Amino acid sequence: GSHMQAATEDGQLLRGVGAAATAVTQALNELLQHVKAHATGAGPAGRYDQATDTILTVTENIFSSMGDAGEMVRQARILAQATSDLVNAIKADAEGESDLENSRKLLSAAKILADATAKMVEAAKGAAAHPDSEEQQQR
Numbered sequence: 589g590s591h592m593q594a595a596t597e598d599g600q601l602l603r604g605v606g607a608a609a610t611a612v613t614q615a616l617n618e619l620l621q622h623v624k625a626h627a628t629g630a631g632p633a634g635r636y637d638q639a640t641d642t643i644l645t646v647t648e649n650i651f652s653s654m655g656d657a658g659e660m661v662r663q664a665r666i667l668a669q670a671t672s673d674l675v676n677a678i679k680a681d682a683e684g685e686s687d688l689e690n691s692r693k694l695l696s697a698a699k700i701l702a703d704a705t706a707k708m709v710e711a712a713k714g715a716a717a718h719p720d721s722e723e724q725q726q727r
Contacts, residue, residue, distance in 0.1 A: 589652060589653055589656065589659070590652070590653050590654060590655040590656040590659070591656050593655060593656060593657055593717045594655065594657070594717035594718070595655065596655070596715065600715050601654050601655050601715050602654065604711040604714055604715045605650065605654060605660065605708070605711040605712055605715050606651070606654065607711070608704065608707040608708045608710065608711035608712075609647045609650050609651055609708055609711070611700070611704035611707060611708070612643065612647045612667070612671070612701070612704040612705055612708050613644060613647050613648070614704075615697065615700040615701045615703075615704045616640050616643055616644050616647070616701065617644075618697055618700070619640070619674075619678070619694075619697040619698065619700075619701055620637075620640050622690075622693065622694070622697055623635055623636065623678070623681075623694070624637075626685075626687065626690045626693075626694070627681050627682075627685055627690070627694070628681075628684065628685055628686050630684075632677055632680070632681070633680075633681040633684070633685075634681075636674055636677050636678070639670060639673060639674040639677065640674060642670045643667060643670045643671055643674065643705075646663045646664075646666050646667045646670060647663075647667060647708065649663045650663050650664060650667075650708070650712060655717075657715070657716035657717045658716070660712040660715075660716065661709075661712050661713055661716055663712075664708055664709045664712035664713070665709070667705055667708055667709065668705055668706075668709050671701050671702055671705040672702060672705070674698070674701060675698040675699075675701050675702045678694050678695065678697075678698040678701075679695065679698065681694065682694040682695050682698075
C-alpha cells in the first residue's frame, strides 16, 4: 500500500515500474505454464508452484504500492531473491530434462525471469521518488 509520497506527473511510476513489473508477471506466467506442462517430474523438477506464487504476489504488491517507494524496494528485494531461486531451480531441471529443446526454452524463459526481475529492482529503485538515502549531495 502506498502512503503519501511523490506523484509522478509524467507517470514514471507506471512507465518504469509498471512496465518492468508487467514483464515479470508475464515471464512468470510464461514459464509457469511452460514448466507445468514439461520437464521430468523427479523431485524439484516439473513445477515450482510455490516459487512462482511467491514472486507474483511480490510483483503485484509493488503494483498496489506504486508510489510508496520504500515498500516497492522492499518487495523488489524479495523479488530478486525469489526469482533467482526459481531460475536456479530451472537451470538444474533443464540439465536433466528428457526434452533438450524444452530445456533450452526453459533457460531462455528463466533468463527473462531474472532479466525482468533486475529491471523491476531497477525501476523500483529508480522511481523511488527522491533517492536521497545516502546523503545525495544535500545543499
